[PDB]
Design a protein around this ligand. Sequence first.
Ligand SMILES: Cc1noc(C)c1-c1ccccc1
Ligand SMILES: Cc1noc(C)c1-c1ccccc1
Lengths: 108, 108
Amino acid sequence: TNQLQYLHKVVMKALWKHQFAWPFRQPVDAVKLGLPDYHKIIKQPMDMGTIKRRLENNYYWAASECMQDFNTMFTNCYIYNKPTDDIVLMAQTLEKIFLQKVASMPQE
Amino acid sequence: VTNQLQYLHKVVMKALWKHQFAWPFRQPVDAVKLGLPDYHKIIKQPMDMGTIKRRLENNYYWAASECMQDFNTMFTNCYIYNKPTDDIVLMAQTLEKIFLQKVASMPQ
Ligand SMILES: Cc1noc(C)c1-c1ccccc1
Ligand SMILES: Cc1noc(C)c1-c1ccccc1
């Protein structure tokens, strides 16, 4: 759709290149990061790499569905991490940009 | 008074305000009442639907994005402060899904 094209080419491209985006471009690697409780707490892992691949494989049926995945990614970060962790501030910044760009999305 | 702000008031806020899970969000978190002495130490910008509704009623917002950021802050505060297993997190997620669904059809 026009909306999914906007989410891919306008919203995602703007988040992806951001200086705080690198932790969110691929799944959380709990082994590498040494977080053995990560998958016990976060039951629906999500990241922008997964979202981008879904957008490109025509996985989504509606823009809302893609937006839900972005939300899961941010929510997972807030739920798992300590409120004072830098990663929370990084998610908040990206999330604010996501909403700004979503506000200008085409209507269909 | 913009087309988008009207949508936020008449479609988004209308849908969320009356929801069966909305009650904890209709007024600011009362840390004294709930016995949460650390709430304001962790959450620096409290937000709730009553405040947002008032702002929409009183033409406080200059742009739809500003209102959208208030909704987002309300939900994000809830995910950051509470434990992963708290019911309030599920309630917030249910409301936020509706928020995103409706926002996907907001006028461009
Ligand atoms: C992203 C993200 N969400 O939770 C954690 C933990 C991360 C993360 C932190 C550092 C590097 C990569 C991912
Ligand atoms: C909403 C909300 N966010 O954190 C807390 C704590 C609440 C809350 C829980 C029960 C009743 C009212 C607010």
